Amino acid sequence: HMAPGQKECDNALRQLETVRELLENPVQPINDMSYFGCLDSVMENSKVLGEAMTGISQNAKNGNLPEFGDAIATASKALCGFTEAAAQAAYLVGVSDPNSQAGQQGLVEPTQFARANQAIQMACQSLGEPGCTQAQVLSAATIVAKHTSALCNSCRLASARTANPTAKRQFVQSAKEVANSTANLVKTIKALDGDFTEENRAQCRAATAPLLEAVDNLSAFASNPEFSSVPAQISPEGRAAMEPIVISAKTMLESAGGLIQTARALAVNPRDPPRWSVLAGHSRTVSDSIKKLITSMRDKAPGQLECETAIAALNSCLRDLDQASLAAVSQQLAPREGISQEALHTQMLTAVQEISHLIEPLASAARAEASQLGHKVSQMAQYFEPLTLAAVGAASKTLSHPQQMALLDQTKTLAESALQLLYTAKEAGGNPKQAAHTQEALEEAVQMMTEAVEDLTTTLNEAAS
Numbered sequence: 001h002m003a004p005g006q007k008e009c010d011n012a013l014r015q016l017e018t019v020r021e022l023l024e025n026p027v028q029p030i031n032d033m034s035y036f037g038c039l040d041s042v043m044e045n046s047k048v049l050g051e052a053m054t055g056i057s058q059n060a061k062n063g064n065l066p067e068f069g070d071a072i073a074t075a076s077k078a079l080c081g082f083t084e085a086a087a088q089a090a091y092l093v094g095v096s097d098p099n100s101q102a103g104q105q106g107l108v109e110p111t112q113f114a115r116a117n118q119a120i121q122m123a124c125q126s127l128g129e130p131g132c133t134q135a136q137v138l139s140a141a142t143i144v145a146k147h148t149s150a151l152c153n154s155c156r157l158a159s160a161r162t163a164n165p166t167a168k169r170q171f172v173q174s175a176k177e178v179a180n181s182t183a184n185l186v187k188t189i190k191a192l193d194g195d196f197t198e199e200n201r202a203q204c205r206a207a208t209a210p211l212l213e214a215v216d217n218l219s220a221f222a223s224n225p226e227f228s229s230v231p232a233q234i235s236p237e238g239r240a241a242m243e244p245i246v247i248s249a250k251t252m253l254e255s256a257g258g259l260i261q262t263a264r265a266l267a268v269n270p271r272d273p274p275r276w277s278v279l280a281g282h283s284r285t286v287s288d289s290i291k292k293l294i295t296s297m298r299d300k301a302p303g304q305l306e307c308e309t310a311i312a313a314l315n316s317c318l319r320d321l322d323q324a325s326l327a328a329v330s331q332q333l334a335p336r337e338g339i340s341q342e343a344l345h346t347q348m349l350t351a352v353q354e355i356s357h358l359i360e361p362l363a364s365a366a367r368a369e370a371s372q373l374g375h376k377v378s379q380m381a382q383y384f385e386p387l388t389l390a391a392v393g394a395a396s397k398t399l400s401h402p403q404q405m406a407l408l409d410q411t412k413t414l415a416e417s418a419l420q421l422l423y424t425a426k427e428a429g430g431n432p433k434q435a436a437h438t439q440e441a442l443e444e445a446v447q448m449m450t451e452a453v454e455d456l457t458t459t460l461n462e463a464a465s
Contacts, residue, residue, distance in 0.1 A: 009072055042082060042294055056068065094232070109154075110229070116151055120144055123141075185207040241305065309378070310378060317387075347387075414452040
């Protein structure tokens with residue numbers, strides 16, 4: 001018979017296999033956590049798992065089997081918590097890609113219901129054909145009953161999950177009607193008695209009509225947008241962004257399973273140096289996987305990827321300005337055609353004014369509002385496109401060489417100030433408990449951008465008058 005603690009290990013291993021499924025093709029939210037809620041959860045589950053891991057080893061070593069069982073159960077709970085949070089974070093990452101599309105969580109999958117309905121329709125037709133063999137009849141009845149059983153099971157699960165009292169009744173009653181009609185149908189068939197089956201083919205045919213009506217009605221009820229589940233469509237970019245989180249979470253589950261299988265043996269017999277080594281190896285990998293998971297999740301927090309693309313954009317602008325300065329000095333900057341100096345000057349000032357308008361709202365998001373940060377840094381970076389292009393244009397048409405070089409330099413200085421704001425905004429990231437150096441660097445970046453805006457505005461205002 002099984003010693004205490006052994007069933008706990010098997011249960012945990014089964015739970016880990018089940019929870020791993022959440023990491024395969026996440027197209028729905030796992031829970032109601034925000035991204036920073038996910039980050040909070042992994043930190044808390046980390047602490048719990050750590051304590052359970054100590055309990056697993058300590059109690060396997062000391063031969064305290066009831067306590068060992070407890071520690072295994074706790075580890076399992078913590079690992080399931082870990083995975084749910086990782087899967088939610090991964091989903092949030094994937095769906096937030098601009099090429100992805102949002103879904104909705106419901107009670108029933110309308111496409112699965114539609115396919116079940118179609119299968120049932122074809123199979124009932126098959127079941128009612130003239131001169132069918134026994135094998136043909138049993139095969140058709142198998143298709144019908146398999147699908148009705150699935151539909152009934154989904155209805156019962158839906159009925160327990162809905163807050164809508166009418167929907168609850170509808171799901172329960174539909175389940176009852178479909179099961180009842182299927183039961184009436186299979187009663188006309190005997191798997192190992194062909195004579196009875198042949199004799200009752202008329203009753204079987206009659207029994208298909210009420211089943212078909214009840215099934216078709218149920219499939220329609222499922223299409224009701226209030227209950228329908230519609231999977232998010234996650235882009236290749238979205239899948240690529242979420243992969244480091246998924247990989248880390250999968251490795252944690254794999255190593256944790258190894259840890260549990262090893263500990264299960266050590267509990268029964270602790271005098272086993274090779275299995276203590278194996279336990280330590282899995283413990284190391286579980287632990288490292290946790291660090292990797294937490295880092296991967298932090299790297300994909302709201303705002304982080306947008307900060308990376310914004311930084312890339314600003315660097316591209318600085319390259320263009322550098323190239324323009326190089327061309328101006330080597331007499332190779334061709335005057336731009338099909339646009340006046342006045343138009344270029346207006347475009348510059350408009351861009352500068354919009355950049356200036358964005359400084360404080362960007363800083364506000366970087367301080368305390370990660371959910372707003374991505375949009376603000378994108379807007380900021382975008383406005384350097386028209387500024388940089390209009391600056392190069394304006395510099396190409398200026399008769400004064402000092403004016404030409406000053407325009408490029410003051411535009412470059414503003415772009416460099418923006419770069420520093422972007423880096424510091426990324427580090428701050430709307431995070432709680434930012435280091436003092438992080439917070440002050442952000443505020444200094446704000447002040448320097450402001451200085452840079454004023455200086456370029458003065459030049460543009462002086463050129464205007």
